[PDB]
Amino acid sequence: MKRFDLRPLKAGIFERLEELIEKEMQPNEVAIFMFEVGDFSNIPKSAEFIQSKGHELLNSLRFNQADWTIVVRKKA
């Protein structure tokens, strides 16, 4: 339970829900957010809603093909 399927969450709100789950995720845990929309710039925007400093996308998102996944590490 350390991931969020934003696929069915269409685009626009998927970046707003990512914050709702970030609260459950540990302050130093990984979060796999799946995005089907080409909007890759929004991926990091969601994790930012929590705190300007702390959310850092290690690497996993491959915006270019079918819905991909991105790992997010919490910290602040």
Side-chain angles (χ1 to χ4, degrees), residues 9-25:
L9 247 112
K10 72 173 93 166
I13 323 183
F14 80 121
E15 176 251 305
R16 267 145 111 165
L17 250 305
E18 235 126 321
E19 170 251 305
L20 250 96
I21 182 59
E22 267 310 336
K23 253 180 97 272
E24 237 245 312
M25 303 299 305

Side-chain angles (χ1 to χ4, degrees), residues 34-74:
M34 312 217 157
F35 65 107
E36 77 94 86
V37 187
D39 284 12
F40 74 89
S41 91
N42 267 258
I43 272 296
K45 207 238 200 225
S46 339
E48 194 233 327
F49 232 96
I50 312 289
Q51 220 270 74
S52 198
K53 305 108 105 281
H55 72 297
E56 231 260 320
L57 291 308
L58 257 139
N59 254 18
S60 164
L61 93 161
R62 197 92 159 178
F63 98 93
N64 256 319
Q65 229 322 282
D67 154 80
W68 228 249
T69 83
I70 176 58
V71 284
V72 197
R73 49 132 93 173
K74 270 254 294 138

